[PDB]
Structures are given as structure tokens and as C-alpha cells.
């Protein structure tokens, strides 16, 4: 995020980091319950990547994080990578996350819910702060 | 480029698809929602994470960080997967697995 700010640690408890074998953060995701993470289809996750929950500072060794294996990747059949449309994947975890103050689920909408133009929302992540 | 060690956040507004098309044209589909163009931008490494909106005391996943400006321009809207268009697929996948 360009021109954002640092979060309060633990205050976005559904935010996960998707990391490869080397520990490299390549995408975010959101816990929707103890067993499932929602992410983008174009992140290209497989069962060799891991979901890291409970993190704030990826340079710190002193956080009690959960490094969670992925059992199965469910890329939505409707995903069109050429138009980047329907850009959603579900990750089923091999072993459940342990919910805590810093690890818990985001809510999902109903299909009919209205989110009006002009509403102020929030996005979070470890993406670049400067291009 | 600069990658942060610590988790970042930003507040940003939702756009309409009709208005978002003034930036992105026919690239904008019904299963996308645009947000930003407000002085912040999602950027490389944010993809897959949340766009959440608060109502009735709780945060709901409205978007999934997807794509946008190749330079993470803060005056161009970011494009997010529109969760309302995708949630029926989510709930089913959970319940079947």
C-alpha cells in the first residue's frame, strides 16, 4: 500500500500472508473461519505455499505466528486470467488455525448486499509502499 | 521500490463501475469493484488481501485486492474482486468440502 500507514499490531486478525517455501511473502489473504482462507486466484497458490497467520512485523522473530499448511486449492471455475475476472481462490488448511486475539475471521456479505459508491472502506497488506 | 516489514492499512472509497470505466474502460466487469483514486493505492504484494467495509459494528469482506495501475498510482482506482458476486461460490465450496 502506497501512502498508507502502519496498522496497530494484531488489529486486522483475518489478514494472512501467503509465503512460498523460501519464506517470501507474495500475496495476502483473509481467514473466513478456522479452516479456510480467501485470496486472489491470480496469486497462483499451490499446496507447497503456506498461510502465515498472526503476523505483524515480517522482520520479527518474536511474534507467535501460525505457519499453516494448505491441503487444497480451490480456484473458482469462473476465473478468467486473461481478463482477471472472478479473481478468487479458496485455500483449505490441512490443520485448523487456532483463533485468538490476533487470529480470527472476517465476515462475508450476502450476494444481495449493497456497498454504495462513496463508502469509505479499508485495505491492508504487506505490498510495496513505493513503486 | 520499498517493501514494508510491518503490516500497512489505508482508508479509501468505493467507486461505481460506471465511473471506474472512465479510467479502465471495458476492463471493468460486474465481478470487479473499484476503490481508491484517493491518494492511496494497493500495490504489488497486496494482492489477495482484504478490502473491508464496516457496518453494524463489523467488518465485511467487500473486495479482494486484484489489479490496478502498473505504477500503483494514487490517482487511479484499484480494482478488487467483488465479493458479493463471488460469495455464493464461496459458501457452497465450504459446505461441500
Amino acid at each position: 500500500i502506497v501512502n498508507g500507514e502502519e496498522a496497530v499490531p494484531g488489529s486486522w486478525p483475518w489478514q494472512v500472508s501467503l509465503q512460498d517455501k523460501t519464506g517470501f511473502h507474495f500475496c495476502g489473504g483473509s481467514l473466513i473461519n478456522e479452516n479456510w482462507v480467501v485470496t486472489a486466484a491470480h496469486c497462483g497458490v499451490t499446496t507447497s505455499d503456506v498461510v502465515v497467520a498472526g503476523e505483524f512485523d515480517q522482520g520479527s522473530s518474536s511474534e507467535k505466528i501460525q505457519k499453516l499448511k494448505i491441503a487444497k486449492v480451490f480456484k473458482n471455475s469462473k476465473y478468467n486470467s486473461l481478463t482477471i475476472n472472478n479473481d478468487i481462490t479458496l485455500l483449505k488448511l490441512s490443520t485448523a488455525a487456532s483463533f485468538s486475539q490476533t487470529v480470527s475471521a472476517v465476515c462475508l456479505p450476502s450476494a444481495s448486499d449493497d456497498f454504495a459508491a462513496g463508502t469509505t472502506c479499508v485495505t491492508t497488506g504487506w505490498g510495496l509502499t513505493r513503486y | 521500490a520499498n517493501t514494508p516489514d510491518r503490516l500497512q492499512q489505508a482508508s479509501l472509497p468505493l467507486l461505481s463501475n460506471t465511473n471506474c470505466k472512465k479510467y479502465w474502460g471495458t476492463k471493468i466487469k460486474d465481478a470487479m469493484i473499484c476503490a481508491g483514486a484517493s491518494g492511496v493505492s494497493s500495490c504489488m504484494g497486496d494482492s489477495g488481501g482484504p478490502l473491508v467495509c464496516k457496518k453494524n459494528g463489523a467488518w465485511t469482506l467487500v473486495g479482494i485486492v486484484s489489479w490496478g495501475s502498473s505504477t500503483c498510482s494514487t490517482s487511479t482506482p484499484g480494482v478488487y474482486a467483488r465479493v458479493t458476486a463471488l460469495v455464493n461460490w464461496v459458501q457452497q465450496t465450504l459446505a461441500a468440502n
Binding site: 496498522a7 494484531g10 486478525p13 480470527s104 472476517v106 465476515c107 479499508v122 | 492499512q9 473491508v52
Partner: peptide
């Protein structure tokens, strides 16, 4: 869902 135990500050 949706209610952090550690409240975010924007």
C-alpha cells in the same frame, strides 16, 4: 466474524 479483539485505529 468481523470484530477484532484488538481494535484497529485509522
Amino acid at each position: 466474524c468481523g470484530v477484532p479483539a484488538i481494535q484497529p485505529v485509522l
